[PDB]
């Protein structure tokens, strides 16, 4: 997280705001609800208090505007700039302006007013932009899902380094960005995608170029807004530029940023028993047209040519891959080697000699 130079913080704890005007995109009640919610995010973890004024000069004057809207800083029409706010101070200090060329909503569509406002008010209280892609204070908007909003841990620490903690935080365990240097790191799923490793953890993925040592960290929703935050398994069809993503009994096929026509589908369509309730890991072999799918302690092999399950399946992992334990968290394949992830460990399995040839912490895939 980052605070402002000179550490601009408010002096008093009891603060006022005023919704100077409104957008036509939403009713007055919805807008007031969004703004109230946005303030609650910050008040829930600080001694700060917020009060709405219907008339006069408040500390935080909130307005909607379009292009040239009265300051030095015109808005730019649809998308791009969503809003701007000033740090704590007198007059413009604390003020927040919203671009009414955006379509503001209380849903996943257009732009969510509560989300932008919660971000905007972070500035109004003295937080600068964060470099953590998982932080609310990250400079770039991402709809984070209809799930109930939890302030991320980077923002809690930032704001509490300004104003200390509150009496009681309604959920004290705040979402943290995963730490790649932590040797206890376990993974959700892995694939290659256009020659790069995609490593899923929680609502994030790392993308790592083979020529790079520092992975890029994204929110999954940054790439695929209509996909779940957490995924179970991922695999690639490089021939068709397709990635396949599993979560519960659904699965999607993706072409770049696009969900193919017809997806998500049920995994039962793959020929899975109806009692299989998640795929734990998956890997495709293109020189064979065969995909391996893991769940609990079993493997299925799927024929990606003839579009059916192979006959001798399911089999036990303990029979086909002796020594890797009883589950597969995530798996990928490279250069005749299969990489099996089980908790904090990865097993390097040689297809050639049909044995584990190497063992190392899961996080070492991220050069850590």
């Amino acid at each position: 997280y980052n605070v402002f130079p000179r550490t601009l913080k408010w002096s008093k704890m009891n603060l006022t705001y005023r919704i100077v005007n409104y957008t036509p995109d939403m009713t007055h009640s919805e807008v007031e609800k969004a703004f109230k919610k946005a303030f609650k995010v910050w008040s829930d973890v600080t001694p700060l208090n917020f009060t709405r004024l219907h008339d006069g000069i408040a500390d935080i004057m909130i307005s909607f505007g379009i292009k040239e809207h009265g300051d030095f800083y015109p808005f730019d029409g649809p998308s791009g700039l969503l809003a701007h706010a000033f740090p704590p101070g007198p007059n413009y200090g604390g003020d927040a302006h919203f671009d009414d060329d955006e379509t503001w909503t209380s849903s996943s569509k257009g732009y969510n007013l509560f989300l932008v406002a919660a971000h905007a008010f972070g500035h109004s209280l003295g937080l600068d932009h964060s470099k953590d892609p998982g932080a609310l204070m990250f400079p770039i908007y991402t709809y984070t899902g209809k799930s109930h909003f939890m302030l991320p841990d980077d923002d809690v620490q930032g704001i509490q380094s300004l104003y200390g903690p509150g009496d009681e935080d309604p959920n004290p365990k705040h979402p943290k960005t995963p730490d790649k240097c932590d040797p206890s790191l376990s993974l959700d799923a892995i694939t290659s995608l256009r020659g790069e490793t995609m490593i899923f953890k929680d609502r994030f993925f790392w993308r790592l170029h083979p020529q790079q040592v520092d992975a890029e960290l994204f929110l999954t929703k940054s790439f695929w807004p209509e996909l779940p935050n957490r995924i179970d398994a991922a695999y690639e069809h490089p021939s068709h530029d397709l990635i396949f993503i599993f979560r519960g009994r659904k699965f999607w096929a993706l072409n770049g940023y696009d969900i193919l026509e017809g997806y998500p589908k049920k995994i039962s369509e793959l020929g899975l028993p109806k009692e299989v309730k998640k795929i734990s890991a998956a890997v495709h072999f293109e020189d064979t047209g065969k995909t391996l799918l893991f769940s609990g302690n079993q493997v299925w092999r799927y024929d990606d040519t003839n579009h059916i399950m192979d006959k001798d399946y399911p089999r036990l992992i303990e029979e086909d891959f002796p020594g890797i334990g009883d589950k597969v968290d995530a798996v990928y394949e490279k250069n005749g080697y299969i990489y099996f992830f089980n908790g904090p460990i990865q097993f390097e399995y040689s297809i050639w000699s049909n044995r584990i040839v190497r063992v190392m912490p899961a996080n070492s895939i991220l050069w850590c």
Binding site: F72, Y73, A85, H119, D128, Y141
Partner: peptide, 14 residues
Amino acid sequence: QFAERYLRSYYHPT
């Protein structure tokens, strides 16, 4: 007189 130079802007790309 004041730090209205620390305007921060929130962004999404087209």
